[PDB]
């Protein structure tokens, strides 16, 4: 909680492609906003089985005079038709334009909406999805930071309230290399590590909010970051989360 980009999430009933009525949104709010459309076949390192990677993140690129997150208010809409829930909506910032954007999104397509109070396995999965940094070679190296997995289990009588687990970056790489090699360091090493140490099934735990260092504050439902963008494999797994 020292980073600005707040990214509340939202799911979509059925996919409708967007470039048809971008004139309609630009009509209603009178402000030219780019819609970018681009295929990405994440898992871009192909260890996912190559199953329906048609991922076309639609980028309502609210590119006006950059004075706020109410001025830069980029959206990302990732879609896959061959998955049951097809599509979700992210949105950054705190603009009031987004309200009529989503209102129109309900309206003109006839789709129904719900937020995502996602869960523990979710938080861990996208947690270590956050640290694979995208390379131009697309063989993607592994960054590291320092976890601070704040919980807040209520018990009876507020007796425990809140108890941290913090890991230096050194120990992140330690349990990485001692595993050894992966692209899933958390579920492969770290939560197996601390299960073997403190016997804390952090999967089963009432987690509330993993912080990773200087880089995100994943919360109960609302990933917050320090980048004007979200990594695409992160977006992939958050699409993967809601599915069945």
């Amino acid at each position: 909680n020292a980073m600005p980009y707040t990214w509340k999430f939202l799911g979509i009933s059925k996919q409708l492609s967007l470039e048809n009525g971008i004139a309609k949104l630009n009509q209603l709010l009178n402000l030219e906003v780019d819609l970018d459309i681009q295929t990405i076949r994440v898992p871009s390192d192909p260890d996912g089985g190559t199953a329906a990677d048609e991922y076309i993140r639609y980028e309502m690129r609210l590119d006006i005079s950059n004075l706020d997150e109410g001025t830069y208010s980029k959206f990302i809409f990732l879609g896959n038709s061959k998955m049951e829930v097809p599509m979700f909506l992210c949105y950054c910032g705190t603009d009031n334009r987004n309200e009529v954007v989503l209102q129109w999104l309900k309206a003109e397509y006839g789709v129904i909406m719900w937020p995502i109070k996602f869960e523990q396995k979710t938080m861990i999965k996208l947690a270590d999805a956050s640290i694979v940094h995208v390379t131009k070679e697309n063989i993607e190296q592994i960054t590291w930071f320092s976890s601070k997995l704040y919980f807040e289990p209520e018990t009876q009588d507020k007796n425990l309230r809140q108890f941290s687990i913090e890991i230096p970056r050194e120990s992140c790489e330690g349990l990485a290399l001692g595993y050894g090699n992966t692209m899933h360091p958390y579920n492969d090493a770290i939560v197996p590590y601390i299960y073997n140490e403190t016997g804390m099934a952090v999967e089963r735990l009432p987690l509330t909010s993993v912080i990773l260092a200087g880089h995100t504050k994943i919360m109960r439902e609302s990933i917050v970051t320090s980048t004007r963008s979200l990594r695409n494999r992160v977006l992939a797994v958050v699409l993967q989360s809601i599915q069945f």
Binding site: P153, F163, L175
Partner: protein
């Protein structure tokens, strides 16, 4: 002043303690006994006893006449502490001490700050004496009385290594500590109290936690050594059933860890196995609304320097809360943390020392303020 003393004197019960206070406060006195007899049977108008004695028999010598408020709000617990050892340049301690030799530091601070008082006390379940110790310091305004600023407390138990002074961390706090360092020296012995763990709670659950008790380290999973709740004496046939005792088959298998970490399913077990889960929890954190701790530990921070593959592995682990380890059996009863792999140092045996364990070598981290 009168508002402050009314906030104090409303916290009191009445019964005859007010009678004895006002008795020695009045040190007329023949028939004052028959004033107070009637006011014992008219011990009814409870709050306005305060101002009526405070006006009939009413900050220079008055200090002991108010400090019995501290003497009797020692009844409750509300305030806090922190402990401090008493070394000698070798790690040998002592605090073997005759009581009335406190005129010594009275005179010694009187050499350095102005005229002054401090009643001693004696708690009466738990055997320290404690020193309510009001620093009369100043008198300025930019009217002839002096300021009684901040009653700093020093309680020390009988024959410990430990004293626990109160928590202020000031240039008068450390001054009175600096005095009471030297006035307990008495032999050109060297005292120089260093500090331990920073947070705290109240008196009984600081001395049973540490000091001159028998739990010096006896707590956690070990209170059956604290109490002597088995292996009674030379008796004969109690020990036969004590050599014919129960147990779960809480198997230490790795396949059992597969059964516990993985393999989540329904109830599927009778109340015996449910009971045995519950006393696995109980024996892990106590050793027998019941589900509190013994002692309120309030916040701790553990550490964990494993070394693995000749390479250090360091997780820090801070807690917070309002009482932890009781919280942890009340968490672990929900089968949330997988009890057999709960090591002792966060099972809670150390009594609130945020130590930095490493390969089973729990410590303290001296860590002066």
């Amino acid at each position: 002043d009168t508002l402050v003393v009314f906030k104090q004197l409303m916290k009191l019960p009445v019964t005859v303690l007010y009678d004895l206070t006002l008795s020695w406060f009045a040190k007329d006195i023949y028939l004052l006994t028959e004033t107070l007899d009637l006011l014992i049977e008219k011990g009814v108008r409870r709050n306005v006893i305060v101002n009526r004695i405070l006006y009939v028999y009413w900050l220079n010598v008055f200090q002991l006449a108010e400090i019995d408020c501290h003497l009797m709000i020692s009844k409750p617990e509300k305030f806090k502490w922190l402990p401090s050892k008493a070394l000698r340049g070798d790690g040998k301690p002592y605090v073997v001490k005759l009581q009335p030799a406190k005129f010594i530091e009275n005179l010694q601070t009187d050499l350095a700050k102005i005229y002054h008082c401090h009643v001693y006390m004696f708690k009466h379940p738990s055997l320290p004496v404690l020193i309510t110790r009001i620093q009369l310091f100043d008198s300025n305004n930019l009217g002839k009385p002096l300021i009684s600023r901040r009653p700093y407390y020093v309680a020390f138990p009988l024959n410990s290594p430990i004293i626990f002074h109160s928590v202020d961390k000031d240039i008068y706090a450390r001054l009175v500590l600096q005095s009471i360092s030297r006035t307990i020296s008495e032999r050109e012995t060297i005292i120089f109290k260093p500090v331990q763990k920073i947070p705290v709670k109240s008196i009984h659950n600081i001395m049973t936690l540490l000091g001159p008790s028998r739990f010096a380290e006896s707590m956690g999973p070990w209170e059956c050594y604290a109490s002597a709740n088995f292996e009674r004496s030379p008796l004969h046939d109690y020990k036969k059933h004590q050599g014919l005792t129960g147990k779960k088959v809480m198997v230490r298998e790795f396949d059992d860890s597969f059964l516990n970490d993985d393999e989540n399913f329904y109830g599927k077990e009778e109340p015996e196995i449910r009971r045995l889960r519950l006393e696995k929890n109980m024996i892990k954190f106590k050793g027998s609304s019941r589900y509190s701790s013994l002692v309120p530990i309030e916040k701790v921070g553990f550490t964990l320097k494993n070394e693995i593959n000749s390479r250090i592995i360091t997780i820090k682990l801070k807690f917070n809360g309002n009482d932890i380890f009781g919280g942890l059996h009340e968490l672990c009863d929900k089968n949330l943390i997988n009890i057999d792999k709960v090591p002792g140092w966060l099972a809670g045996e150390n009594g609130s020392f945020s130590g930095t364990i490493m390969n089973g070598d729990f410590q303290r981290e001296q860590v002066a303020k």
